[PDB]
Symmetry: C3
Amino acid sequence: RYLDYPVLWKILWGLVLGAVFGLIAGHFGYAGAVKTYIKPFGDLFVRLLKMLVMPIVLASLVVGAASISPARLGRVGVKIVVYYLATSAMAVFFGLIVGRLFNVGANVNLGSGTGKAIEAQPPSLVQTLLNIVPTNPFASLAKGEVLPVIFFAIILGIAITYLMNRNEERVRKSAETLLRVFDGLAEAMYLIVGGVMQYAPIGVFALIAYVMAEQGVRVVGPLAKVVGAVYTGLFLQIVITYFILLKVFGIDPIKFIRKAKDAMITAFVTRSSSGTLPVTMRVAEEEMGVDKGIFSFTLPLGATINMDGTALYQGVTVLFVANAIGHPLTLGQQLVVVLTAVLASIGTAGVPGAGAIMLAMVLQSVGLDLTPGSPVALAYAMILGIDAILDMGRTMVNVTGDLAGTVIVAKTEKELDESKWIS
Amino acid sequence: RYLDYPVLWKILWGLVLGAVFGLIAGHFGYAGAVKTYIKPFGDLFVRLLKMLVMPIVLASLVVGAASISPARLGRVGVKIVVYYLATSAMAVFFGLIVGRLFNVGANVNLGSGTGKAIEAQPPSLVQTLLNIVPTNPFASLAKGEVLPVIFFAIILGIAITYLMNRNEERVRKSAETLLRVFDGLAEAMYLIVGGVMQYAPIGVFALIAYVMAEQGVRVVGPLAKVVGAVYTGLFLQIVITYFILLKVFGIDPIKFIRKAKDAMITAFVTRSSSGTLPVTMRVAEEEMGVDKGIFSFTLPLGATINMDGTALYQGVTVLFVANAIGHPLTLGQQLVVVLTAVLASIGTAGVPGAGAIMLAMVLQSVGLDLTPGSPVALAYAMILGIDAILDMGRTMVNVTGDLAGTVIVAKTEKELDESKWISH
Amino acid sequence: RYLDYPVLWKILWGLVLGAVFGLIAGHFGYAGAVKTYIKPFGDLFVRLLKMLVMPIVLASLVVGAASISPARLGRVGVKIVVYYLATSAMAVFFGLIVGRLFNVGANVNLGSGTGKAIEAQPPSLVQTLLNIVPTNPFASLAKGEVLPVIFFAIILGIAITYLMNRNEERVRKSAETLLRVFDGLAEAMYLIVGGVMQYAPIGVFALIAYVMAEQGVRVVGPLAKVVGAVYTGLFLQIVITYFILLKVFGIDPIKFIRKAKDAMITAFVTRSSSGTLPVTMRVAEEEMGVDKGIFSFTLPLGATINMDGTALYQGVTVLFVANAIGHPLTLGQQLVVVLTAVLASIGTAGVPGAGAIMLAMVLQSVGLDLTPGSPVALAYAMILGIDAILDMGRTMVNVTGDLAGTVIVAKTEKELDESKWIS
Ligand SMILES: CCCCCCCCCCO[C@@H]1O[C@H](CO)[C@@H](O[C@H]2O[C@H](CO)[C@@H](O)[C@H](O)[C@H]2O)[C@H](O)[C@H]1O
Ligand SMILES: CCCCCCCCCCO[C@@H]1O[C@H](CO)[C@@H](O[C@H]2O[C@H](CO)[C@@H](O)[C@H](O)[C@H]2O)[C@H](O)[C@H]1O
Ligand SMILES: CCCCCCCCCCO[C@@H]1O[C@H](CO)[C@@H](O[C@H]2O[C@H](CO)[C@@H](O)[C@H](O)[C@H]2O)[C@H](O)[C@H]1O
Ligand SMILES: COc1ccc(NNc2ccc(CO[C@H](C(=O)O)[C@H](N)C(=O)O)cc2)cc1
Ligand SMILES: COc1ccc(NNc2ccc(CO[C@H](C(=O)O)[C@H](N)C(=O)O)cc2)cc1
Ligand SMILES: COc1ccc(NNc2ccc(CO[C@H](C(=O)O)[C@H](N)C(=O)O)cc2)cc1
Ligand code: NA
Ligand code: NA
Ligand code: NA
Ligand code: NA
Ligand code: NA
Ligand code: NA
Ligand code: NA
Ligand code: NA
Ligand code: NA
């Protein structure tokens, strides 16, 4: 009887009520009760979306790569990769600026020497690039590996179209049947995404409630200042980077935000961009009128290697650690931070646990090593205390950047349905 | 020269001859030879049947969920879950009764104090229920996890039907092509099931022979009384619970048993219900006239969370252990046993080794802890010595209960083909 | 920009140039540079080929087993298995002959006792044969298990054909749709194989260069004789065994080598028969005109259980070790070597790491045990020092034998397209 209420209002109600409920439950210490009785519903929501992530990616990208020329696909790839790199660098820049504004970690007052102990190397860029090419596509499917599925789906769709243009009719009909199987699978997946969005408000409520209950009490003092800095920086990344980039390429930013709100809230509460990918793709298709041959390629790739929010978070935490141990970063050191954050977002393409590897890389780049028992590790552990509070906002901005780049590239390729943007 | 012989006679001959052969070979101690030369054929049979389980489940259920309304699907689910819980409770009750009748373990005479230190714990019910929803369906397919595949296949079939009732023709044609792929796969699977049933007598013979050769000598003394008890209870669970439930809803029980015979014997010799699933569904379709939209959903669900024979076995062994260590169970304790056995069938939905987790849970419910070196662990090992002899019958009764509940629900939903139930 | 150059000549140029480049770089000690900068390209080639192996096998075999009668399928299986066993025995015989000819290991002069302790075990024939039948075909697909996928695809194709000959129309149309899906998948796979053969020269160059640079310096002294022996034997296995078997059944051997050159060079540089399988199947179809219902079954089966080159290598290395420790093999011992080499080719059907298992098995068959610190283990390590130089030729001859047997069985079943064999 509740399905009749509109979904977007229900999701916003769940968000607001879960935030307030979690704060109130953590203020009275019932956070364990929230983890035991309320959290499983949000976990169910996240499982329902993660269920859809792999089939929708495989099928939608086979279809899209079929419904597009290889030259256009490569041009779109170059465009979207340039967008991703530029926006990530801008996110690190905004993170450093907002950190210097908030003066994060200035009152932690830890003593640190000039000692330096050599650590291990980051995972090889070459091996990750080779790992883009799978050695068993069924295996990469079972393992949830996005980038190799992207590669295989693109190759499969291109082969299918080249087969549909043959003289023999049996070959054409076989390729047509195969493409129909993928299209029916994709349609079913998007249908199910729409179905799951009906339960989405409950999961939104439960997830925001659990996070607020477990980490609301920790947002005081310097960690509170960190939270304020990170969220301000994210806000700027949307309102300056994304809005100016959308106006430069002629897209109404407010309509963009209104359409993306669903993927935004899903990413904010699930804190997993790849797990928001189904809602993100459904917003790209059935809200913004982006063609499948664009978003079916850019959105998984973007969920994997485009995290503006993570880059801004890294800029803030590196300023925090440097100011907390008492060695503020020189200008050239912050330039190294930006360069290393972008190159490390690239180099960490699809590995698990990439957040901490990237953060360790950025810290090591300026000579802040995570030796155990050292003040640097201490400040890093301080930051990790509010990691979920930060993860919400950073994942939201990651998905929002994915969508903005998708829309910009689609507008530049005239693959954007303008009829969705006129009132 | 082989295929021309009738199949039912061949499987029955293989069962009986393998039982006698295994008994005779194990009584004279050549059981190792049976393990080396005879068992691999039964192993081949089990592998051939296990091979089909995942494709046939996925395809049959996508097809069935497509060819049915979501409201009817929900009604069937509620019906079959009520049937399953009621029959499991009835099985624990029958196990307790037959155990009290045979006075199992009364002459083991072990000394036991009243000390108990907690060892096991239940796997969280919430996490088990959440694990039903997969997070990667390709992975769940690869790992053989039935319940998440069931969930994904139902969601996919419903989406396919909702797409076929759309206005655009391209969407209809894509959804129909997909449903045809799944239907062709399922048809191929059932074809292969029929083909493998030709080799079934050899594997049946080998399996019953190996089990009889390895565990025939052990059916003496108190364990003998256990076997005689357990099988009796299993028999009663078939003859009273199933037959009365079938006559209540207007199903001739003898026709039901005659049709289920193939799945019954397969479950009895392979001792894995999910591994019997292909024969069970092929019997449900091509023998009992159950609609795919019913059995394609109930039979795997029943193989996973409906084990009447295992519940009756638990009822028997709890009385056995309590009588062996010298502490017979109170009436209220037996009621708690029934309640916890039913709740534990749910709580172990799809976990590996669920038999022992459920048994440990039921024992702990009445305060019998399996600390090593204690007399309770000793009696439990006594019981585990004949686990295969018991596993045959209990798995058979698990599969038979699945089939009976499926036919009952199909009769109540007018989804049952009456033309298959008329004799000439 | 170089794509316009013909492909086969480019593959030959890459082979020769990589051999020379690797030799030159390894003699001057720059092998690390080759491993760091050159090898990743050959690795990319090998991963690209490995990607296709599972889909092409599954789909091509479903199609072929569908498009053939079960009686003919069984006849073809018997024929190709007899061919495989005969050629493996012949290869062991040639290996023993060329080893005794080159007097391999005669000048190592190691002292050896008479101790014999068993190392690894053979997997029980019963358990391996049972393992041929999968218990989850999705699992075998994900794990790359070739033999169970072969079994499942054959059973599925036979079921599909039996369904297409039914009276109900829904059954016919469903099975027909499924077979269309598998046919489209296989067609797409062969298309992509052809596409990857465009990058094949780069990978050929890189692989041969890396191998020659890392193990070129080691081909001196007694090991040099081993190389001289092994390749000689390999050469003989091609020019006597295969040529006589092709001439007996009326196939011009030179045309066969000309058509097979692609799979030959791919096997030689990638050293993986299953990884050459796509090129091998494409050569069987679009060069030799072998029907899918033949090669789609014999070629994966041959890559798995037909290794003439490996058998010849075993024949050479057992004589090498026996002469190195000072106990040359009696006539009955060499007969035991041949028998056990064939029986071990059968018994290790599909196990991982079978290369070392088979060699340890044959050595144990003649009483040469790999106890650590023993001289037998020492000679085995000597051979493993040049195992890669040997592996190139070994895989090449394994794949060539696969193709030769496929063409012979196809000629005997009148499933061979003669129009490709006219000058
Ligand atoms: C584990 C148990 C979880 C319980 C969750 C309950 C599932 C929700 C019940 C179904 O609700 C409907 O599902 C449709 C699915 O199609 C949605 O249509 C959506 O999808 C279609 C897109 O083609 C369009 O009808 C609409 O744009 C779009 O609202 C529609 O909103 C919604 O009312
Ligand atoms: C390790 C090697 C294993 C070899 C397995 C042995 C194969 C035996 C030869 C074929 O035997 C027939 O195979 C058919 C299927 O292939 C079956 O059709 C059956 O299956 C159909 C299912 O659609 C039914 O409709 C038919 O009525 C029914 O005859 C049939 O019963 C069976 O006699
Ligand atoms: C830095 C270098 C990187 C290079 C990567 C770029 C890949 C471009 C591939 C171009 O090569 C063509 O690919 C076609 C397949 O895509 C082949 O068609 C072939 O494939 C069909 C198979 O269906 C056959 O029937 C046809 O006869 C046959 O022309 C064709 O032979 C081949 O020339
Ligand atoms: C402890 O929680 C975990 C832990 C591990 C995983 N698996 N893989 C993975 C890999 C990388 C990330 C970084 O991405 C963003 C961020 O964290 O900065 C944010 N989450 C986003 O999705 O955009 C995130 C996850 C998932 C959740
Ligand atoms: C000993 O071999 C095995 C093989 C697999 C496992 N893991 N999963 C599992 C889960 C539940 C059961 C209970 O089901 C019956 C029983 O045993 O009571 C009987 N098997 C049947 O299929 O109906 C049995 C197994 C454990 C042991
Ligand atoms: C690097 O390549 C490989 C390839 C496969 C694996 N896995 N298991 C396996 C399987 C087979 C072999 C036989 O080996 C042949 C030889 O050497 O005579 C030659 N390599 C060949 O493929 O025909 C050896 C091993 C590991 C590495
Ligand atoms: Na970016
Ligand atoms: Na993620
Ligand atoms: Na992202
Ligand atoms: Na029950
Ligand atoms: Na089971
Ligand atoms: Na059952
Ligand atoms: Na051979
Ligand atoms: Na390999
Ligand atoms: Na081979």
